[PDB]
Amino acid sequence: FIQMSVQRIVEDAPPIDLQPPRYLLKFEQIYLSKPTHWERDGAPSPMMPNEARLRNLTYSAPLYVDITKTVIKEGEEQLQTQHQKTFIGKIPIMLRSTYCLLNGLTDRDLCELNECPLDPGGYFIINGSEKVLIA
DNA sequence: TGAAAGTACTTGAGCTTAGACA
RNA sequence: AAAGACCAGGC
DNA sequence: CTCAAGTACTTACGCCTGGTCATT
């Protein structure tokens, strides 16, 4: 879903056509970062899953896309403006997936994070509670 | 992705005739 | 906290 | 005007425990 489906969905959306000047919006490519928490002061910092549970936070990662804005002014010169890393929302991250902060960590690393090495993961942390999607 | 059934409504159809006596 | 929904579970 | 043949309502166990969530 993260690697393929999101990119396919954003690229398959029809471009925004507006109109007289014309405006075109195109979404180039998605970007996922590690799950980070934006505090009251706005300073980002990685969110560990245990901190998400205890503080009733949402273990999610921000989503950034590249947006190119094209204006047609009828003067034969269309000005295209590209925006990098445009934040459009946060996607909850399944625990121990590829994009989770627990990915690839050894038993000692997980213990240092107060996470059970035997915990299989595969569930989302929404508002502190642990949610599992059923097929 | 796959009730089931009973009841209260409508709506259409649609059918030889002749006058005298009777 | 109030009733609403949803979910899981016991017999 | 008046008979059979189509379209609408109306309902499907008994409790009991709890946890979560959005509105208020």
Amino acid making up residue A21: P
Q: Is the CB of A123 under 7 A from strand D?
A: no
Residues in chain A: 135
Which DSSP symbol is given to A99? T
Task: Find residue A131's DSSP bridge partners.
Answer: A124
Q: Is the Cβ atom of A24 within 7 Å of strand D at any atom?
A: no
Enumerate the nucleotides of strand D whose atoms come under 7 Å of any protein CB. 20-22
Computed from CA positions of residues A101, A107, A104, A109, in that sequence, does the dihedral angle turn out positive or negative? positive
Question: What is the 3-state composition of chain A as percent helix, strand, coil, each rounded to the nearest 5?
Answer: 15, 40, 45
Cβ atoms A37, A45 nearer than 8 A: yes
Q: Nearest-5° angle of CA A92, CA A93, CA A98?
A: 160
**Pair A13, A25: CB distance under 8 Å:** no
A126 touches strand D (CB under 7 A): yes
**Cα separation of A112 and A115, whole Å?**
8
- The residues, ordered by sequence, that sit 6+ positions from A15 with a Cβ below 8 Å of its Cβ are A24, A25, A26
